[PDB]
Amino acid sequence: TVTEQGEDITSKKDRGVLKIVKRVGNGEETPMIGDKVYVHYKGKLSNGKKFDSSHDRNEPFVFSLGKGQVIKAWDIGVATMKKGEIAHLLIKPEYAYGSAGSLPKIPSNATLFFEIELLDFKGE
Ligand SMILES: COc1cc2cc(OC)c1OC/C=C/COCCOC(=O)[C@@H]1CCCCN1C(=O)[C@H]2C1CCCCC1
Numbered sequence: 001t002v003t004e005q006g007e008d009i010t011s012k013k014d015r016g017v018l019k020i021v022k023r024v025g026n027g028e029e030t031p032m033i034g035d036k037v038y039v040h041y042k043g044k045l046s047n048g049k050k051f052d053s054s055h056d057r058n059e060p061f062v063f064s065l066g067k068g069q070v071i072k073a074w075d076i077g078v079a080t081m082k083k084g085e086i087a088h089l090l091i092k093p094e095y096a097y098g099s100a101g102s103l104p105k106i107p108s109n110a111t112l113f114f115e116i117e118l119l120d121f122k123g124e
Pocket residue numbers: 041043044045050051052069070071074102105106112
């Protein structure tokens with residue numbers, strides 16, 4: 001395998017967000033912009049120095065798709081997913097925290113990795 005694998009799901013096609021479907025989902029609907037979305041996730045910096053998971057909070061993570069409550073990669077990435085799907089996302093800094101970073105958690109120009117399971121979504 002290669003590092004830069006997965007489908008480029010960016011609009012600009014700059015391979016900034018690469019997606020692999022690891023578990024196929026059910027039903028033909030993906031969420032609409034503005035839908036409330038319910039997920040479980042495991043995330044990390046590619047340097048392995050930091051890790052975050054919804055399981056640490058012992059409850060699904062909920063956000064409104066496409067409202068910028070999460071990094072760009074998530075708004076783009078979760079919009080592509082079916083209910084029940086598990087996907088991996090490899091994310092360059094331009095679709096995460098950029099050259100400014102987000103200290104102390106996220107250094108400048110960080111690459112991020114997430115596994116996300118789309119549990120459900122509801123039209124608000
Ligand atoms: C567990 O707490 C955090 C988790 C992430 C980022 C954080 O601040 C940048 C962060 O600090 C508290 C702030 C939370 C508010 O949302 C920040 C935006 O977070 C995000 O957009 C993405 C996706 C949704 C789950 C959290 N996200 C994060 O990047 C995590 C990081 C934490 C470090 C490992 C890689 C993931």
